[PDB]
Amino acid sequence: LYNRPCLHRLKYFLRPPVHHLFFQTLIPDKDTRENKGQRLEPIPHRRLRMVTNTIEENFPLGTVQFLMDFVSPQHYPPREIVAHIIQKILLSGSETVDVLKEAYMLLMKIQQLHPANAKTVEWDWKLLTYVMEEEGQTLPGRVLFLRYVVQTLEDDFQQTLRRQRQHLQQSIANMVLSCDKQPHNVRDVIKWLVKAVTEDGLTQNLTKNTNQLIVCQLQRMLSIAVEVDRTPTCSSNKIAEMMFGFVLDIPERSQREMFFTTMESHLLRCKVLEIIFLHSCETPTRLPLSLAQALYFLNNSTSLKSQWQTWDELVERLQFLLSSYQHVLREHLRSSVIDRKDLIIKRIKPKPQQGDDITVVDVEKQIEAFRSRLIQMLGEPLVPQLQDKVHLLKLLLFYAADL
Amino acid sequence: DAIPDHHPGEEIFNFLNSGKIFNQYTLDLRDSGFIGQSAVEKLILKSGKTDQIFLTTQGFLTSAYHYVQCPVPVLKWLFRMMSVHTDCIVSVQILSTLMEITIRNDTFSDSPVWPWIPSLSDVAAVFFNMGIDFRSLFPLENLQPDFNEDYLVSETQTTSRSEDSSYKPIFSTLPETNILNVVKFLGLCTSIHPEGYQDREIMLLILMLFKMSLEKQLKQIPLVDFQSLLINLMKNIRDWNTKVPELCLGINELSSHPHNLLWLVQLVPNWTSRGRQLRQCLSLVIISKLLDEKHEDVNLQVSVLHRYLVQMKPSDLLKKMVLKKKAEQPDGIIDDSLHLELEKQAYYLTYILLHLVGEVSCSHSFSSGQRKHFVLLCGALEKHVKCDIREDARLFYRTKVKDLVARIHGKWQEIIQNC
Structure with a gap:
């Protein structure tokens, strides 16, 4: 019988952020309301003077310390100070790691206490491009810079989604990641993602984690991009077509597995798999996306290294497709986010979709048919791993969205 | 370095004893066991x-x-x-x-x-x-x-x-x-x-x-x-x-x-x-x-901090550690090298104490009379700490502590003038 808070505000974007500072803004009660009471201000003139003095003598550690002591809930650093700390120190390629440590703590404190908005952001896409693409610069602070960027984007998206009931014209994502307006940026981030995945290091360790984290961050940016506009469907289609060719030419398999596994936007993975499957099938299919379509691909698909590995790969692709299909059906991702909020608050139920009218007999017959086809084209006994994978697909289909 | 800028840390985790209970090859949700109907x-x-x-x-x-x-x-x-x-x-x-x-x-x-x-x-x-x-x-x-x-x-x-x-x-x-x-x-x-x-x-x-x-x-x-x-x-x-x-x-x-x-x-x-x-x-x-003060149920804070500052005189702590080590050492003879080592130790201790004073001094509520305390406080730093500190170019740690005291003085002066 405890007075739970208004948990509804947490359902809007359940996907993982980098940090959970949002827990400090849940309470819509006396504590937070009275804390916000005072009107904010900038760093006092004299304090500003001393901190700039600290800047002058090229003693970055003193600057970070003094800023840490001065930043408080009733004051914020002027934008110039934020730009200085980020560009001058964080991405400086000379100092030691501890300086980057303190810088990260400083930025995190600023972001935790003051929610950055569009009119106050520091970095620009040009700087991101410089740090990422312009190789020949191995900046130790690159990972932290990317983490800060993604955290800023996520915070801004959440705040704008909460505040604005009929628009999103004042969000960082809107003006730095909208596919309609800056599609070249989307292309560049996809290129960076495929580059990072392709970066060797796996064959038959510390930097592997770096690539993994940056890849997760890029996937987060893609996921937010897929929602920034009003209609997820068109943006997802655009993104899927731009990434189809890039995913096509990935040399090895494990890279493709990492690419698909890390996928965050469920609709994006669904579209990518659907497009590749259709491109890999001789006879096109006009049936919309549904379980019937899953069986359609299962039957009429082919291979686009002994072939059993390829068939294994297709099995995994179909399981991914079924998982993402279930997720989209249950989450109602098709609608916009702004009205999806009202949908989830009202807790309206989904509805059956055309092409989902199948029975257990159908799936059993289809699975037996595929088993026969695989034996015919390869023989028996199948590889034990392949056996396990087909068995797993059998159970997943038997799920059959049994209603 | 005579005064490293970060806590040394310590070995809490032991790898050879990490994972005595379970690993990823042992946890399965099948073993939990439930009535299978759904x-x-x-x-x-x-x-x-x-x-x-x-x-x-x-x-x-x-x-x-x-x-x-x-x-x-x-x-x-x-x-x-x-x-x-x-x-x-x-x-x-x-x-x-x-x-x-x-x-x-x-x-x-x-x-x-x-x-x-x-x-x-x-x-x-x-x-x-x-x-x-x-x-x-x-x-x-x-x-x-x-x-x-x-x-x-x-x-x-x-x-x-x-x-x-x-x-x-x-x-x-x-x-x-x-x-x-x-x-x-x-x-x-x-x-x-x-x-x-x-x-x-x-x-x-x-x-x-x-x-x-x-x-x-x-x-x-x-x-x-x-x-x-x-x-x-x-x-x-x-x-x-x-x-x-x-x-x-x-x-x-x-x-x-x-x-x-x-x-x-x-x-x-x-x-x-x-x-x-x-x-x-x-x-x-x-x-x-740290100051070896008896834990006797620790405005009065003003006099207590003054007492501390009196105790944190680098020469005083140097001589205190000299006495303690001489008692500990069977001979009781300290060379110039070990003298300088104890000097480093005392400077490190004083650095830490001044840091703690800096943190404690910060406050948001003040009466008018508090001014005097701050006036005394800085004075003590100037008198009980600064004066006994003699700058030596070849000895950077002295410069570090002196500059730290200077920063504390600056912050306290700014706070005082804020009224």
């Missing part, structure tokens, strides 16, 4: 072993748990996996699944059974599996948990229905990712269900978290979520004023090296009232301890 459970118990991880990562449980509470052992095994899995992406995905299922259930779980949150037994289990000793988890004999190590080990092992394989460490290097997910989940549960823990439990959690932070190989990894969880826990306690001094003494008692104590003073958050209270009280306790 397609969810039937599929799970008919599913293989790797299909288990596949189902977890791709949100199959989240898909299958939109209107039904997830059984508690399922969440417990998910927590275990998040804690023990080596790969980073799988661990992050498992944590995401845990957050999603917990939030959804809570939004639909109005039943008296509150959302599952790892009891101290669970967190102790995971951390000990990581390679933290019981005393390391709880190093204050005065405050100890409600159980013992053997109970935890036997219960967790028997629940996990093994010398067969030569025990390799589950992690040959700091499991940063797993620790981060564990603390993130802890913060989530603390923030969603505040009254889920008891005051004593909260205190034990604070003690173990602070002790863990002192890890040697964790110096380079920013512990922001540590601060977030600290904020939540400090906010959770119900008898605050009464509980503050006990906690302060507890943190004081964790270790001996003063720079580590300075670290823990710095690490606590300082943008919430209770955080500031903790900071100032902990600083008072530390300054009382």
Whole structure:
């Protein structure tokens, strides 16, 4: 019988952020309301003077310390100070790691206490491009810079989604990641993602984690991009077509597995798999996306290294497709986010979709048919791993969205 | 370096003893055992072993748990996996699944059974599996948990229905990712269900978290979520004023090296009232301890700080340590080299003390008469500290301490003139 808070505000974007500072803004009660009471201000003139003095003598550690002591809930650093700390120190390629440590703590404190908005952001896409693409610069602070960027984007998206009931014209994502307006940026981030995945290091360790984290961050940016506009469907289609060719030419398999596994936007993975499957099938299919379509691909698909590995790969692709299909059906991702909020608050139920009218007999017959086809084209006994994978697909289909 | 700028740290984790309970080759949700009637459970118990991880990562449980509470052992095994899995992406995905299922259930779980949150037994289990000793988890004999190590080990092992394989460490290097997910989940549960823990439990959690932070190989990894969880826990306690001094003494008692104590003073958050209270009280306790002052139930703070400053005269402490070492040393003869070494030690100690004075002095409420105290305070720094400091170009540590005193003087002067 405890007075739970208004948990509804947490359902809007359940996907993982980098940090959970949002827990400090849940309470819509006396504590937070009275804390916000005072009107904010900038760093006092004299304090500003001393901190700039600290800047002058090229003693970055003193600057970070003094800023840490001065930043408080009733004051914020002027934008110039934020730009200085980020560009001058964080991405400086000379100092030691501890300086980057303190810088990260400083930025995190600023972001935790003051929610950055569009009119106050520091970095620009040009700087991101410089740090990422312009190789020949191995900046130790690159990972932290990317983490800060993604955290800023996520915070801004959440705040704008909460505040604005009929628009999103004042969000960082809107003006730095909208596919309609800056599609070249989307292309560049996809290129960076495929580059990072392709970066060797796996064959038959510390930097592997770096690539993994940056890849997760890029996937987060893609996921937010897929929602920034009003209609997820068109943006997802655009993104899927731009990434189809890039995913096509990935040399090895494990890279493709990492690419698909890390996928965050469920609709994006669904579209990518659907497009590749259709491109890999001789006879096109006009049936919309549904379980019937899953069986359609299962039957009429082919291979686009002994072939059993390829068939294994297709099995995994179909399981991914079924998982993402279930997720989209249950989450109602098709609608916009702004009205999806009202949908989830009202807790309206989904509805059956055309092409989902199948029975257990159908799936059993289809699975037996595929088993026969695989034996015919390869023989028996199948590889034990392949056996396990087909068995797993059998159970997943038997799920059959049994209603 | 005569004065290193960061706490040295210490070896808390031991790799060769990391993972004595369970690993990823031992946890399966099949062994939990439930009446299989829904397609969810039937599929799970008919599913293989790797299909288990596949189902977890791709949100199959989240898909299958939109209107039904997830059984508690399922969440417990998910927590275990998040804690023990080596790969980073799988661990992050498992944590995401845990957050999603917990939030959804809570939004639909109005039943008296509150959302599952790892009891101290669970967190102790995971951390000990990581390679933290019981005393390391709880190093204050005065405050100890409600159980013992053997109970935890036997219960967790028997629940996990093994010398067969030569025990390799589950992690040959700091499991940063797993620790981060564990603390993130802890913060989530603390923030969603505040009254889920008891005051004593909260205190034990604070003690173990602070002790863990002192890890040697964790110096380079920013512990922001540590601060977030600290904020939540400090906010959770119900008898605050009464509980503050006990906690302060507890943190004081964790270790001996003063720079580590300075670290823990710095690490606590300082943008919430209770955080500031903790900071100032902990600083008072530390300054009382280090100066060899008898713990006689420590405006009067003005005279107490003046007394301290008198005691922190570098020459005075130098001679005090000279006396102590001469008594300890069977001969009692100190060479110029060892004299200079003790000089470094005394300068280090004074550096730490001036830092603590800087932290304690900060305050937001002041009466007019407080001016005089500050006027005296700076004077003492100028008189009881600055004058005895003689600049020597070849000796940089003197310059460091002098500049530190200069910064303190500047801040105090600015505060004074603010009126």
